[PDB]
Structure 1
Amino acid sequence: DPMVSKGEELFTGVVPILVELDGDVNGHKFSVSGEGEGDATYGKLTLKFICTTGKLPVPWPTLVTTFLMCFARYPDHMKQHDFFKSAMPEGYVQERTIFFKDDGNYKTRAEVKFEGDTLVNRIELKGIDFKEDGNILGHKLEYNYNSHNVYIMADKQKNGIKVNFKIRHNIEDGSVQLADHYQQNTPIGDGPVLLPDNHYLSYQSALSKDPNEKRDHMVLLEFVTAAGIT
């Protein structure tokens, strides 16, 4: 399939990644830069994020979903359903609203695209209606992360996809903070794209710290595999 080929030829080996985020949550401004690499053959992402404005005013785990679905490992029998690669190199827009139960919400807009050989994720995030002393602004979430399936469906009227899913962040007291994600992606280019059957992506995420890093940061290792179309 010369269309499946175009995608294969962009993601075959290790691809450098750059992420940039501009954020304002309840008027708490901040910026984050990330760098690392993806290897979609293994569904593998390795990234390190640095708050370049000082202290991040929200918990790092709350940003993980915001900070690259084009690096999902699609099994061979499922290559016809990989929208994300099919949009490259021109890329796609990823928009979310993330509703934190009993607290505020994030609204994000990202553009994911190649800049030469580098895969770039440029994001703007606005958070509103958060509580001062809540789980997010009061930093009460543990520095860890649970595994999660993400259900992708076609959005054929918009030539894109919609993705709906819940993340549960562990709170320090042992309870959980629900974060209900709503997502839409649309290609940036005018060309054809693969629009998938219903299927899901399986995520595993591991959060760690760079021992030699003094700035406020997060090291993220993710594995992502498409499934659910036998």
Structure 2
Amino acid sequence: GKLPVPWPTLVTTLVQCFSRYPDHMKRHDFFKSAMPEGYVQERTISFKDDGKYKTRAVVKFEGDTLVNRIELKGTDFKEDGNILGHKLEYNFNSDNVYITADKQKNGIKANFTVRHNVEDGSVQLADHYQQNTPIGDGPVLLPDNHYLSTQTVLSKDPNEKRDHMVLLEFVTAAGSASQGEELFTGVVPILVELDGDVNGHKFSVRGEGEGDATIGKLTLKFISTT
């Protein structure tokens, strides 16, 4: 079957612990400090003049594998809009994601807008609100204000018959300190599992790959089931 939404609209939902934090910023890496116990990451993604995604994810280690388990609920979408109508370009341009501390949740938050190119030349906006909280009771690092700058390229496996997305992504923070930071000194296998429902259309996505936080690099292949 076919994914009922464009693959670019799921990129931000489908592991910021793999961002490269420079040495002078290691004291501000909340994402790694919450590991291995993990953190909960919740988002609302409002597509302008269209529907919304509500997501809740658990990001934690299972053995040496970093696992991202997500539940996605999409509502109020137009069957003929840019999302359900598959009208977006197959790409994903750069973002500066400003991270701020959420003191009383012992975590972080962020608000940023993603710009998806539409095939007719217009742009589809996706307003992200994000909240992260740690799962364990151990100490975590609460950061000063900073941001993560991203680069992403999407491609296809020419022999893969299933609906799928190959992703390569580099992320650096700008603008050990924790036991969890040490878990990311090398290449870490990644598994992502998303269960989705958009306007009643159910689907699931599984991705496999690896991340290298020393250079901020993510390589993943996602496959959808519908």
Could you state the TM-score of these two structures normalised by the residue count of structure 1?
0.76
* Distance in 1 (alpha carbons) for counterparts of 2:25 and 2:65: 25
* Distance in 2 (alpha carbons) for counterparts of 1:95 and 1:210: 31
* Distance in 2 (alpha carbons) for counterparts of 1:158 and 1:93: 11
* Distance in 2 (alpha carbons) for counterparts of 1:149 and 1:205: 13
CA RMSD of aligned residues (A): 0.5
Residue matched to 1:132: 79
Give, in angstroms, the shift of residue 212 of structure 1: 1.4
* Distance in 1 (alpha carbons) for counterparts of 2:32 and 2:159: 35
Residue matched to 2:130: 183
Residue matched to 2:166: 219
Aligned length: 175
Q: Report SS of the residue matched to 2:50.
A: coil
Residue matched to 1:151: 98
Residue matched to 1:197: 144
* Distance in 1 (alpha carbons) for counterparts of 2:99 and 2:25: 13
Q: Give 1:82's aligned amino acid.
A: D
Query: Identity of paired residues, percent?
Result: 89
Residue matched to 2:24: 77
Q: Give 2:65's aligned amino acid.
A: T
* Distance in 1 (alpha carbons) for counterparts of 2:67 and 2:132: 16
Per chain length, whose mean CA-contact separation is higher, i.e. which structure has more relative contact order (CA < 8 Å, sep 6+)?
2
Q: Give 2:21's aligned amino acid.
A: Y
* Equivalent position to 1:160, from 83, 94, 107: 107
Gaps of 5+ in 1: 1-53
Give, in angstroms, the shift of residue 191 of structure 1: 1.0
Listed one character per residue, the Cα deviations across residues 11-48 of structure 1 (whole Å, up to 9, x for unaligned) are xxxxxxxxxxxxxxxxxxxxxxxxxxxxxxxxxxxxxx
Listed one character per residue, the Cα deviations across residues 25-74 of structure 1 (whole Å, up to 9, x for unaligned) are xxxxxxxxxxxxxxxxxxxxxxxxxxxxx210000000000001000000
Residue matched to 1:62: 9
* Distance in 2 (alpha carbons) for counterparts of 1:78 and 1:117: 25
Residue matched to 1:22: none
Give, in angstroms, the shift of residue 149 of structure 1: 0.4
Q: Give 1:151's aligned amino acid.
A: Y
Could you state the TM-score of these two structures normalised by the residue count of structure 2?
0.77
Q: Give 1:119's aligned amino acid.
A: L
* Distance in 2 (alpha carbons) for counterparts of 1:73 and 1:223: 8
Give, in angstroms, the shift of residue 211 of structure 1: 1.2
Give, in angstroms, the shift of residue 219 of structure 1: 0.4
Q: Give 1:175's aligned amino acid.
A: S
Q: Report SS of the residue matched to 1:84.
A: helix
Gaps of 5+ in 2: 176-226
Residue matched to 1:116: 63
